[PDB]
Amino acid sequence: MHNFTYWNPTKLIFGRGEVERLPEELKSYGKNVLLVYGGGSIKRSGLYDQVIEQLNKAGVTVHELAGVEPNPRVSTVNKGVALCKEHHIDFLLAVGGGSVIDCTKAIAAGAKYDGDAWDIVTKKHQPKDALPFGTVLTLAATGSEMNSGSVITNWETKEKYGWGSPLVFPKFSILDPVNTFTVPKNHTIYGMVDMMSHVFEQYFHHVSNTPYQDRMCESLLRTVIETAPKLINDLENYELRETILYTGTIALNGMLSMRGDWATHNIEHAVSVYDIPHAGGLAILFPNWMRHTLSENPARMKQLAVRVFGVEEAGKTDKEVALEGIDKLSAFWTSLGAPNRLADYDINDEQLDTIADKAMANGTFGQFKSLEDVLAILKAS
Amino acid sequence: MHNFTYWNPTKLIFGRGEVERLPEELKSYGKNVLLVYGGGSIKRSGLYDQVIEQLNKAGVTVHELAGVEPNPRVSTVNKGVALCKEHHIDFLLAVGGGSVIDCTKAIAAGAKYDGDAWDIVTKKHQPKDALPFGTVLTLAATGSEMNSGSVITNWETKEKYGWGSPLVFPKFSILDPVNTFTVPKNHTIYGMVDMMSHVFEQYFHHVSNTPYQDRMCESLLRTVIETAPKLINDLENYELRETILYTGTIALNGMLSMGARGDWATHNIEHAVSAVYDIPHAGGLAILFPNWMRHTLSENPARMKQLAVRVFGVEEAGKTDKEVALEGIDKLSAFWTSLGAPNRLADYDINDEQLDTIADKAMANGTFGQFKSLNKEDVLAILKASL
Ligand code: NI
Ligand code: NI
Numbered sequence: 021m022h023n024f025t026y027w028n029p030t031k032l033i034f035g036r037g038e039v040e041r042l043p044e045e046l047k048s049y050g051k052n053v054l055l056v057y058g059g060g061s062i063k064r065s066g067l068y069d070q071v072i073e074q075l076n077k078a079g080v081t082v083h084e085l086a087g088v089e090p091n092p093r094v095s096t097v098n099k100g101v102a103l104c105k106e107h108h109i110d111f112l113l114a115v116g117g118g119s120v121i122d123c124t125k126a127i128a129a130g131a132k133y134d135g136d137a138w139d140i141v142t143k144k145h146q147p148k149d150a151l152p153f154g155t156v157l158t159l160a161a162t163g164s165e166m167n168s169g170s171v172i173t174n175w176e177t178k179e180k181y182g183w184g185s186p187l188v189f190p191k192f193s194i195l196d197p198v199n200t201f202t203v204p205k206n207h208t209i210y211g212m213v214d215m216m217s218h219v220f221e222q223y224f225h226h227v228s229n230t231p232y233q234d235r236m237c238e239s240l241l242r243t244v245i246e247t248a249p250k251l252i253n254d255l256e257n258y259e260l261r262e263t264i265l266y267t268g269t270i271a272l273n274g275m276l277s278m279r280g281d282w283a284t285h286n287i288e289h290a291v292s293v294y295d296i297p298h299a300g301g302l303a304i305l306f307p308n309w310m311r312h313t314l315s316e317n318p319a320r321m322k323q324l325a326v327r328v329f330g331v332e333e334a335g336k337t338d339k340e341v342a343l344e345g346i347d348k349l350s351a352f353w354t355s356l357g358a359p360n361r362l363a364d365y366d367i368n369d370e371q372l373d374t375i376a377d378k379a380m381a382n383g384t385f386g387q388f389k390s391l392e393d394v395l396a397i398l399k400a401s
Numbered sequence: 402m403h404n405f406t407y408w409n410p411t412k413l414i415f416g417r418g419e420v421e422r423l424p425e426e427l428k429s430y431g432k433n434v435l436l437v438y439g440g441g442s443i444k445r446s447g448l449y450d451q452v453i454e455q456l457n458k459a460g461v462t463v464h465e466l467a468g469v470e471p472n473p474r475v476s477t478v479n480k481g482v483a484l485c486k487e488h489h490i491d492f493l494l495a496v497g498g499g500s501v502i503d504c505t506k507a508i509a510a511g512a513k514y515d516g517d518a519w520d521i522v523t524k525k526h527q528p529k530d531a532l533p534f535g536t537v538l539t540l541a542a543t544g545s546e547m548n549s550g551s552v553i554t555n556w557e558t559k560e561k562y563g564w565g566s567p568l569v570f571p572k573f574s575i576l577d578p579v580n581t582f583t584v585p586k587n588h589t590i591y592g593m594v595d596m597m598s599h600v601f602e603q604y605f606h607h608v609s610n611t612p613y614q615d616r617m618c619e620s621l622l623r624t625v626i627e628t629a630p631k632l633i634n635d636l637e638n639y640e641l642r643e644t645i646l647y648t649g650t651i652a653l654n655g656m657l658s659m660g661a662r663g664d665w666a667t668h669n670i671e672h673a674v675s676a677v678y679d680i681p682h683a684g685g686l687a688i689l690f691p692n693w694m695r696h697t698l699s700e701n702p703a704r705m706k707q708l709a710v711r712v713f714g715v716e717e718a719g720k721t722d723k724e725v726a727l728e729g730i731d732k733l734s735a736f737w738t739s740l741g742a743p744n745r746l747a748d749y750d751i752n753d754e755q756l757d758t759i760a761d762k763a764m765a766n767g768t769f770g771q772f773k774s775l776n777k778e779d780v781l782a783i784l785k786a787s788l
Contacts, residue, residue, distance in 0.1 A: 022416070023415060023416025023417065023419060024413075024415050024416065025412065025413065025414050025415070026412070026413040026415070027410075027411075027412040027413070028409070028410075029408075029410040030408075031406065031407070031408040032405075032406065032407040032408065033406050034404060034405050034406070034407070034659075034660070035402075035403075035404025035405065036404070038404065228640070229640045229643060229644065231624050231627065231628075231644060232620060232621060232624045232644065232647065232648050232651070235616075235620035235623065235624065236617060236620060239613065239616035239617060239619075239620055240613065242616070243612050243613045243616065246612070247612075259609070259610045262402060262610060263610060263612060263613065266402075266613060266660065267613050270407060270659060271613050271617075274656055275651060275656065278413070278415070
């Protein structure tokens with residue numbers, strides 16, 4: 021039983037060398053641009069110089085906000101909002117991954133808000149305006165290049181919250197598979213785990229009559245599973261990078277959600293306190309959430325076990341088939357190098373209660389199961 | 402993989418009773434609305450009264466353009482543009498199927514053009530502005546609820562031209578499966594045959610490395626194959642209508658073709674046939690598509706083979722790629738015939754008398770098609786094989 025509204029105004033520009041589309045795409049906007057990026061990777065790869073060149077071709081007056089953290093922080097958002105006020109910025113260009121875009125979304129909203137951007141992240145102020153912005157993507161993961169959501173951390177309060185607004189869809193996102201070539205193996209693996217985890221979140225629901233969405237989810241998982249072993253030992257293969265970029269962006273922010281569970285993400289956000297790799301936390305927690313919630317409807321995980329993970333049902337219960345499917349998932353991720361226990365990041369049980377309390381700060385959560393549940397899943401991990 | 406730009410700003414509102422979303426969606430537009438619809442169907446079903454009621458809740462001043470033709474005429478577009486200037490229209494609401502939406506798109510562009518809308522249809526004048534419009538869809542799988550295209554007929558010249566513009570995407574389209582309950586058995590079958598055909602058109606290409614698009618196409622075909630036999634014997638089942646309405650939007654909005662150009666040769670040939678004989682579009686496609694598939698098989702048999710194996714359940718053990726594919730084409734043709742679709746030109750009482758004239762119409766713009774570039778001899782062979 022579900023009604024839905026779909027709306028995605030982001031322009032998607034896909035293909036080799038399409039960073040050259042920046043001047044044509046920037047003509048309709050002002051000439052004061054704030055360039056936002058993360059660590060040294062864009063300068064190390066040469067994408068920085070590529071972009072600065074195109075921003076020069078567009079007669080744009082460029083300011084920079086470098087150093088966005090892998091788990092982006094409000095202090096950095098506030099610094100960028102300040103730069104927009106100081107230099108009368110008209111437009112923002114995020115060059116990097118999901119963290120850079122999530123941060124750019126908050127600066128875009130924060131540049132038309134009189135106060136502090138943490139108000140927006142916490143949903144105290146619903147944005148009424150935003151600067152326009154665009155992206156040049158360097159790794160697919162969560163679909164941020166083509167959705168309106170953003171996850172920001174407050175290092176002081178040790179909180180990490182997801183917010184969104186219809187006003188902070190990217191105007192355009194330039195997706196060049198070549199721009200993902202320098203992503204190293206570990207982050208390449210993290211991106212694929214995150215992509216698969218997002219599909220899982222959209223699959224575990226109780227809405228009857230989603231036959232095509234189910235096949236789209238299963239199709240996406242199969243494609244990533246086929247691609248990942250070939251990609252990780254051949255990181256500069258255009259075709260394999262193209263497939264993961266396509267399935268991480270347009271495929272995942274398609275009609276796959278056209279209601280997800282998202283409990284595993286909420287628990288990971290709470291554990292992340294530790295400032296750990298997001299998708300690393302997901303690889304540890306997701307199989308145990310699947311085990312914890314299997315009974316709510318074993319048919320969902322059973323269908324993944326049979327249609328995605330090649331589990332043979334002969335002489336097994338529906339529960340058995342599903343649990344086998346979870347084991348193959350975890351083994352698949354572990355075979356890529358992904359972690360599978362909290363000890364892999366040197367995390368013990370000391371702060372589990374504090375972590376669970378943060379996860380429950382906004383009440384019970386989850387759709388496949390409304391989640392003490394949090395603590396049990398943490399302990400199993 | 403082909404470079405591509407994807408942009409589709411249409412808001413899709415989907416679900417039971419969602420026509421009640423109209424007033425909330427209209428708050429952002431002016432209050433002079435031209436309500437555009439076709440024949441008597443929406444009044445007979447009660448949808449017309451539902452819409453008028455909602456338009457009353459939105460404090461809107463309603464003018465109407467009723468009687469849009471199944472092949473909408475530029476004359477009717479011009480009538481709508483005249484109404485827009487006269488009553489100072491701000492917004493258009495299309496209630497109906499692809500014909501009603503296509504006509505509304507041409508009125509929307511024509512309402513900002515000083516001259517004759519036929520200039521827009523023929524691409525003599527490229528639109529620079531348009532009135533906004535929204536839709537309430539009454540037919541699945543026409544593609545117009547979520548794209549920027551429109552097909553308009555000049556009754557005088559007997560020409561039918563496809564045009565489009567980034568300015569005439571619908572602002573929103575309200576998709577309620579209940580609003581397709583009165584679509585009769587034959588047209589329900591036609592919509593599903595056309596939807597499968599459009600997937601085929603987007604699947605038959607020589608672009609390497611489209612594994613996910615391939616699976617999206619295969620997945621869509623499998624869902625329709627599972628749904629269609631049940632729907633035609635249960636025409637008011639919400640779930641079956643819902644699945645067809647949902648998949649029919651995806652099949653036709655471009656979310657399948659991104660990164661690969663479709664073939665569209667079978668559509669072009671059916672369009673040539675229909676310019677001569679007054680047959681249903683999907684009927685022509687059911688006849689022609691299996692024979693197009695046989696004619697072009699040698700271009701790359703692995704392509705139809707993959708459909709045969711992944712969609713049509715053909716076992717490949719001890720068979721050549723061509724045999725596997727041909728068995729798949731056979732199973733496709735049998736599936737369509739099992740729904741009631743025709744499979745030979747003779748089913749519509751069409752012989753070989755006009756095949757040459759039809760082939761010439763198909764070739765009016767030179768060679769066509771991407772999986773195989775067809776010339777006149779190709780068209781004649783496909784046509785004759787279809788008798
Ligand atoms: Ni994620
Ligand atoms: Ni068609």
